[PDB]
Amino acid sequence: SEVAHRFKDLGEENFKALVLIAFAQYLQQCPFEDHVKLVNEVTEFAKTCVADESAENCDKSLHTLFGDKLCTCCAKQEPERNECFLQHKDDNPNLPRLVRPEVDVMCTAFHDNEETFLKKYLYEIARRHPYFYAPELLFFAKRYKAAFTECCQAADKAACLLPKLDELRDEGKASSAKQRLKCASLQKFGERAFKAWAVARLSQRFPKAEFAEVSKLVTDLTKVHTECCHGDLLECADDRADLAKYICENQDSISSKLKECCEKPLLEKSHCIAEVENDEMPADLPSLAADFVESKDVCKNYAEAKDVFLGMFLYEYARRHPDYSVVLLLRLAKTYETTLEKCCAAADPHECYAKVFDEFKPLVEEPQNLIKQNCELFEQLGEYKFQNALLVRYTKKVPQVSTPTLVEVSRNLGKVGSKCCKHPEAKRMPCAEDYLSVVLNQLCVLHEKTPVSDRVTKCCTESLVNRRPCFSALEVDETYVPKEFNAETFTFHADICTLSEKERQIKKQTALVELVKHKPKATKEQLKAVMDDFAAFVEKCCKADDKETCFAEE
């Protein structure tokens, strides 16, 4: 009995939560209360299974049960139904932006019913983030609960809560985006791509770890994510705990940076492990040359065990390169692979695969130079203007892309600047390029829902590893027809005056996207000249005797 097994392994609380999450991700549009009803029925049922694993319906898969419950798609049978539920996950669901009500209202609701409030949190995130790393969402719910527990008792409920909630929202969106890439990686590119990812990350993270260890953690982590991305949240959370549990029983085989996370309560622990600092690279590790370029058996060993050897390479290269983005290490490993694929078949492989690392230069240089160039641009512009720059860039690159998406991605793109450009070069590239993988992936998923740009589609369906160079390589499509100057898109409301800094940025940014859409191939100064026109008009209308009409007159 799986639902019992999981209920047992997860405990009711996390079971409930994961089931809610699973429901809210399966039925994003469905009301909270219909989800909790389903969850309770499932939980109630799970309990009957914990008690007798032979009770009538307890041997059914989690898929059948959730899907059966969900069905209270639905016309379909398993496993086509679960596939159906998964494919209907909506990365951009038509759901009201979660509008934070005032703290006292929230704090009242939180105290009115903590679980319901906490379940409401899960539900609202999960349904908005249908790929949200479900166990991680439990961690968020815990922190959300902790926020509300403490901050609701605070003198300044808002001043306590808001920053914390802002942190969790941000962390949430980051985690969602992040997990979204795992699911996209897994689902669009397959297990191997994810495995490659994981070998690269974990090798970087756990360079002291033996390859077999990195592999074991990779197979387990992959299994975690496959399950999570597959809406198998229960297995996923459970396998995650198992993985956290494994890692923590095996820290000395994995990382010396694990001390603190492995002491951490279950949810914190996995979260902690998932983002532990890269471990110290083992001292005096040799170059990959003897094994991967220099050996005469390279061709043989690749061929004998391709993915292992490539994994060993990726492991060996990644563990040596926490200063490389995962995608880079992935690119290098793909390059290695493909070079070996041609060298091994070439007249003298030893000869030509000895040169394999020379192909690595451009691959390594490109992100570096990109990260360096764009981060100077960032340091010149700061996050916001860096966002405006990228927003224009991307709008010009892929103008068909919905502006909200454009804005969101560009903003996020620009956020990598803030996150990464602060870092010295040694931490910039993994930070930047991997966050870039996350953000582009956003662009990718957001756009996929309503594809309107063949370039985005192209760049997103192509090698995940190469997704970023692909967008980077994109230049202005002139095959894009500017949109006529709709007033409504450039006639902001007086609500702009009341907008938070961020929201007024999103708005200028939105205008900036639209303006670029209205008139692409306009240069930065001309774009600046209407952006400044807009902001002035806004400044004017915002301080006008009557705002709403001042605004109307544009």
Ligand SMILES: O=S(=O)(O)C(F)(F)C(F)(F)C(F)(F)C(F)(F)C(F)(F)C(F)(F)C(F)(F)C(F)(F)F
């Ligand atoms: O070079 S690639 O990244 O394209 C790659 F071939 F997929 C590879 F990453 F090297 C890889 F070998 F496939 C791998 F990603 F490492 C791997 F598939 F994960 C793997 F290492 F082979 C593995 F599947 F995990 C295995 F090692 F077999 F356990």
Ligand SMILES: O=S(=O)(O)C(F)(F)C(F)(F)C(F)(F)C(F)(F)C(F)(F)C(F)(F)C(F)(F)C(F)(F)F
């Ligand atoms: O080259 S692109 O503009 O297409 C890009 F992929 F978005 C990008 F170059 F990575 C970029 F987003 F523009 C970018 F500026 F490089 C970046 F992604 F934001 C970035 F390079 F990561 C950055 F933000 F500049 C970074 F410097 F990495 F922080």
